């Protein structure tokens, strides 16, 4: 486990750009988890297929949504840490 349960219950308010992302997929209202968005966000990836489907360990996100919001064009999905990074700079954090 590299994020603590209680950060992945983190109740968080999504930036624009980040709740058109969420929407896109289904997702209605304007408050979540990091679990629920983490959730979210995996459905975005398999529905989008950002993705080497030989080697699916490594979504590429360059010239869509999910790269304009995390900045870069591909990143382990192993790397739990820094897509919490990632994932904070376009929310905002509630409690
Ligand atoms: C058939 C194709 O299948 C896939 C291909 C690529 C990605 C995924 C979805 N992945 C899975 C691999 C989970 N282990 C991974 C994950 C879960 C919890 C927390 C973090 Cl930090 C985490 F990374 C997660 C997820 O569930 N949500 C999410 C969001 C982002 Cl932005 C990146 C990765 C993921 C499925």
């Given at each position: 486990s590299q994020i603590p349960a209680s950060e992945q219950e983190t109740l968080?308010?999504?930036?624009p750009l980040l709740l058109k992302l969420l929407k896109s997929v289904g997702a209605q209202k304007d408050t979540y988890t990091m679990k629920?968005?983490?959730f979210y966000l995996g459905?975005?990836?398999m529905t989008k297929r950002l993705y080497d489907?030989?080697?699916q360990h490594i979504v590429y996100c360059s010239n869509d949504l999910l790269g304009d919001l995390f900045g870069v064009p591909?990143?382990?999905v192993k790397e739990h840490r820094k897509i919490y990074t990632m994932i904070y700079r376009n929310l905002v954090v509630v409690n």
């Amino acid at each position: 486990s590299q994020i603590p349960a209680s950060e992945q219950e983190t109740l968080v308010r999504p930036k624009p750009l980040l709740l058109k992302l969420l929407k896109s997929v289904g997702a209605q209202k304007d408050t979540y988890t990091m679990k629920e968005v983490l959730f979210y966000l995996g459905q975005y990836i398999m529905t989008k297929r950002l993705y080497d489907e030989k080697q699916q360990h490594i979504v590429y996100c360059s010239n869509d949504l999910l790269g304009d919001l995390f900045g870069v064009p591909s990143f382990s999905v192993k790397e739990h840490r820094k897509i919490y990074t990632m994932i904070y700079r376009n929310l905002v954090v509630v409690n």
